């Protein structure tokens, strides 16, 4: 299948991403606490529901939450300021909280049922969000021997997600909080996000030599994000 592209709301970021975040791919955004990772997730959960000529995929959303940071009223606000019905947009987001990393892994399996269910409706699932991808794994797998073990569990989790993305033509979007490195990653595309002067947000592609050089810059607004 041809890949689809979901607009972020930012023309700058869209150009950096070559039109938007891709289906049949896992896109990881990573950065420090407060850089706007969860805002980008909220914005995409609306943008994907737009028709294709407005940058969306007429799609449904599934959302796995590990830090209780999902905000339905924020979805409503973004939808409202982009011309969409707030409650209809919320209704097309299926939401689960992952209790721990093991539950998080099972939920990917659980998600496939709804993905199958909607596949030939007018609004198939087109976006699967995992926020945070790594927080449970960080907290549970720690100390001597944990590096190998945690990386193995995470790779397995990511493989499950890659399968859904490829099998059902879905964009997977995941967040990862970073502080201080050198660890392997298996996301299709990695985007480094940081908060800059005057509240602007700046995004850069990491280890993507064949993709645009440069940084995109946007603001967090009532429309989600915009240039």
């Amino acid at each position: 299948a041809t890949i689809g592209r979901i607009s972020t709301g930012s023309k700058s970021l869209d150009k950096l991403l070559g039109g938007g975040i891709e289906t049949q791919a896992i896109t990881e955004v990573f950065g420090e606490f407060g850089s706007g990772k969860t805002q980008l997730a909220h914005t995409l959960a609306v943008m994907v529901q737009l028709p294709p000529e407005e940058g969306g995929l007429n799609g449904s959303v599934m959302w796995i939450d590990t830090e209780n940071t999902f905000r339905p009223e924020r979805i409503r606000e973004i939808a409202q300021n982009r011309g969409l019905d707030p409650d209809e947009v919320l209704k097309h987001i299926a939401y689960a909280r992952a209790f721990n990393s093991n539950h998080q892994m099972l939920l990917v399996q659980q998600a496939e049922d709804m993905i199958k269910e909607l596949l030939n409706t007018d609004r198939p699932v087109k976006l699967l969000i995992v926020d945070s991808l790594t927080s449970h794994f960080r907290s549970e797998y720690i100390g001597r021997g944990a590096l190998a073990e945690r990386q193995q569990k995470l790779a397995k989790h990511l493989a499950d997600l890659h399968r859904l993305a490829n099998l059902y033509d879905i964009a997977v979007f995941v967040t990862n909080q970073v502080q201080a490195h050198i660890l392997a990653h298996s996301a299709t595309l990695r985007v480094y996000l940081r908060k800059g002067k005057g509240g602007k947000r700046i995004a850069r592609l990491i280890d993507a030599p064949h993709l645009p050089e440069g940084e995109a810059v946007f603001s967090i607004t009532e429309k989600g994000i915009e240039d």
């Binding site: 409650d87 919320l90 209704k91 987001i93 299926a94 939401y95 939920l107 659980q110 998600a111 709804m114």
Partner: peptide, 4 residues
């Protein structure tokens, strides 16, 4: 998973 739950709606909304």
């Amino acid at each position: 998973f739950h709606t909304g």
